[PDB]
Structure formats: C-alpha cells, structure tokens
Amino acid sequence: SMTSHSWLCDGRLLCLHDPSNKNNWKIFRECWKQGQPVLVSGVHKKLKSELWKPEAFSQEFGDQDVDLVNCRNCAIISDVKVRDFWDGFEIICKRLRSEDGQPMVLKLKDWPPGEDFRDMMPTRFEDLMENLPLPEYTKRDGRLNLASRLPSYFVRPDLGPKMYNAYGLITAEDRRVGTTNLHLDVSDAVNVMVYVGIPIGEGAHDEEVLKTIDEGDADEVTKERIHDHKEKPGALWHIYAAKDAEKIRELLRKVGEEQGQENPPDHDPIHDQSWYLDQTLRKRLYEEYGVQGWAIVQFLGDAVFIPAGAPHQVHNLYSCIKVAEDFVSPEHVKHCFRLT
Ligand SMILES: CS(=O)(=O)N(CC(N)=O)C1CCCCC1
Ligand SMILES: [Cl-]
Ligand SMILES: [Cl-]
Ligand SMILES: [Cl-]
Numbered sequence: 605s606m607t608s609h610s611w612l613c614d615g616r617l618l619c620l621h622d623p624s625n626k627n628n629w630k631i632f633r634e635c636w637k638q639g640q641p642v643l644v645s646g647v648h649k650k651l652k653s654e655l656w657k658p659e660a661f662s663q664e665f666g667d668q669d670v671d672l673v674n675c676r677n678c679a680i681i682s683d684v685k686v687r688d689f690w691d692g693f694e695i696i697c698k699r700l701r702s703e704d705g706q707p708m709v710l711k712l713k714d715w716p717p718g719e720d721f722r723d724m725m726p727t728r729f730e731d732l733m734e735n736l737p738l739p740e741y742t743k744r745d746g747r748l749n750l751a752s753r754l755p756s757y758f759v760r761p762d763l764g765p766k767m768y769n770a771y772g773l774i775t776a777e778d779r780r781v782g783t784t785n786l787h788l789d790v791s792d793a794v795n796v797m798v799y800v801g802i803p804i805g806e807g808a809h810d811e812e813v814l815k816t817i818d819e820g821d822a823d824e825v826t827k828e829r830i831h832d833h834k835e836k837p838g839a840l841w842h843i844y845a846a847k848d849a850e851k852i853r854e855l856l857r858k859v860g861e862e863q864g865q866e867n868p869p870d871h872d873p874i875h876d877q878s879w880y881l882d883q884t885l886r887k888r889l890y891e892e893y894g895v896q897g898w899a900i901v902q903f904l905g906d907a908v909f910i911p912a913g914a915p916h917q918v919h920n921l922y923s924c925i926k927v928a929e930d931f932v933s934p935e936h937v938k939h940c941f942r943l944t
C-alpha cells in the first residue's frame with residue numbers, strides 16, 4: 605500500500621513518500637520546529653532524467669576550466685577541463701591517477717561557479733525548482749521562505765541552486781575520509797540526489813559499501829531499502845542538532861590538542877571545515893559528551909532537509925550528482941540574526 609510517510613533512525617527521522625502531496629506541511633512542520641532533519645523520497649520520478657546524466661554535462665560544458673580536489677589528501681588539481689572529471693565519473697580506467705598510479709577519488713570544486721547555475725543551465729534550473737518538495741518553504745518566493753523579505757540585520761543566502769559532484773570513496777582506508785567535511789550553514793537547505801553512478805572496471809565493489817553503512821551506524825529499516833527494494837544508495841550523512849554544536853567544538857579542540865595541533869583555546873573547528881567524524885570520533889562524541897546524531901543514507905531521488913545551525917558531513921558511497929537550494933524558514937530565522 606502507498607502511505608503518506610514512515611520513520612527512519614528508530615522513529616527519530618520523518619520520511620515523506622510523495623514529494624508533491626499538498627498536505628506534507630502538516631507532518632513536516634511538527635518535526636521541523638523541534639530542530640530535526642527530514643527526508644523526502646521519490647523526487648527522481650518528477651524530473652526529466654535525460655537532463656541529469658554525466659555524459660550530457662561532459663558533451664555540453666566539457667571545455668570549461670575548473671579545479672578538482674583529491675578527497676584522500678585534500679590536494680588541489682588546478683586549471684583542468686571539466687570533461688577530465690565527467691569522463692571518469694563511472695569508468696574507473698578513465699580517471700586521473702596519483703603518483704602511486706591509483707585512480708583518484710575526485711570532487712569537482714565550485715561548478716557551476718558562484719550564483720551562475722541559472723544562467724548556465726536554464727532548463728535544469730526550471731526542472732529542479734518546479735519539483736522541490738515543501739514548495740512554500742523551498743521556492744525563492746514561497747510564503748514561508750523569508751530569504752527575500754529580511755533586512756541587513758540577517759545573513760541572507762546567495763541565489764542558488766548549487767551543484768555538488770564527486771566520485772564515491774572505495775577502500776577501507778577511505779571509510780575515515782569525507783566528501784564534504786563537518787561544517788554548519790546559517791540558512792536552512794534542501795539537498796536532492798539527482799544521479800547515482802555505480803562504476804565499472806573495478807565493478808564488483810558492493811561489499812565495502814555495506815560495511816561502510818553498517819559501521820556508519822545506519823538503522824535496520826535503512827538497510828532493508830537496499831536488500832529488499834534494490835534502490836541505489838548515493839551518500840552517507842551524519843547530522844547533529846544545532847543545540848549540540850558547542851559540545852562538538854569541545855571534542856574537536858581536545859582531539860586537536862592530543863594530535864599536537866597548536867590552536868588558540870577559542871578557535872572554531874566546525875567553521876575550519878577540516879574534520880570528518882569517523883566511527884572512533886562518533887563513539888567518543890556519544891560516550892564522553894552525551895551527543896547523538898542522525899545517520900542518513902541518501903538514495904537516488906531522496907531530498908535531505910538540513911536545519912540552520914545543524915553540523916553535518918557527507919561521505920559518497922558511489923559517484924553522485926546533488927543539487928541544493930538555501931531557504932530561511934521562520935522556525936530557524938534566529939540562526940542568521942547578526943546581534944545578541
Ligand atoms: C557562532 S555560529 O555558530 O557561527 N553562529 C553565530 C552567527 N551570528 O552566525 C550561528 C550559526 C548558525 C546557528 C546559530 C549560531
Ligand atoms: Cl533551532
Ligand atoms: Cl540547461
Ligand atoms: Cl509547503
């Protein structure tokens with residue numbers, strides 16, 4: 605039977621089933637006011653799937669100049685063609701190699717650049733914006749989005765959306781690394797998985813993906829989405845309540861000191877965007893500071909709602925294309941106020 609919703613993270617995470625259901629707000633707003641993230645599945649079935657393929661991005665935009673990051677060591681690969689990234693998205697033997705001769709795990713940095721998404725890709729922009737869930741919250745001019753309505757006493761988000769493109773992490777050592785490191789945003793955001801690329805050549809890399817999800821602390825119902833429904837998993841997220849950010853800063857100041865970093869006692873390890881919380885650090889956060897998070901596996905077509913001020917990190921299981929839009933809900937506008 606079709607149902608309006610279900611629960612993940614043992615009842616702590618709302619999962620809405622129909623992205624275009626006009627009654628979603630009634631269930632959504634109760635969870636959202638308490639500072640929880642929310643998941644909405646099925647957004648891929650609303651989109652024009654031909655507009656979101658890596659081969660199309662390569663063919664249409666391949667000649668533009670970009671920087672990449674090596675996700676294993678944070679090295680920057682300067683001033684290469686965007687086709688050098690896209691043509692290795694799923695075919696492993698086409699990927700740029702490190703000195704060791706291994707194919708690199710790469711992230712495409714700031715592409716499209718700044719606020720240029722709408723100008724460069726007007727048809728993609730239309731397809732996405734017209735199919736975002738909770739549109740009174742997420743559309744540029746929706747009635748519950750205060751972005752366009754606030755004075756300069758509030759930090760206003762840039763014009764979006766922003767695209768996030770990166771390969772999947774592969775090895776046991778890769779389990780300890782992030783695609784995007786732990787950080788927080790002063791605005792709310794919705795992040796949609798529009799494409800998951802399962803590669804070929806080293807195409808049989810299914811079992812380390814399971815160990816990563818398991819060690820990632822994913823719930824039993826989330827593991828049933830793979831084994832029972834054969835949905836494509838993109839990325840493993842950890843999200844923490846805005847109210848726990850200072851306890852996370854205290855853990856990361858202590859670990860920094862243990863590892864011989866030499867940091868003033870007030871510096872901000874979350875703003876630095878330099879940490880990924882691996883299994884050891886997440887267990888220590890829980891045991892020593894009493895802080896619990898949400899471990900979320902974002903499948904193809906899943907939209908993750910991230911509350912303003914909530915620390916979060918992203919670990920790609922396979923190659924992913926994500927598109928995110930910022931918004932300012934009245935529930936969380938305190939997070940972007942420039943005084944007290
Ligand atoms: C110190 S901070 O965490 O960077 N911060 C203060 C601010 N004025 O932006 C806000 C960040 C969003 C959540 C509420 C706090
Ligand atoms: Cl809050
Ligand atoms: Cl376009
Ligand atoms: Cl809505």
Ligand SMILES: [Cl-]
Nearest residue numbers: 783784785877
């Ligand atoms: Cl990062």
Ligand SMILES: [Mn+2]
Nearest residue numbers: 787788789916
């Ligand atoms: Mn973010």
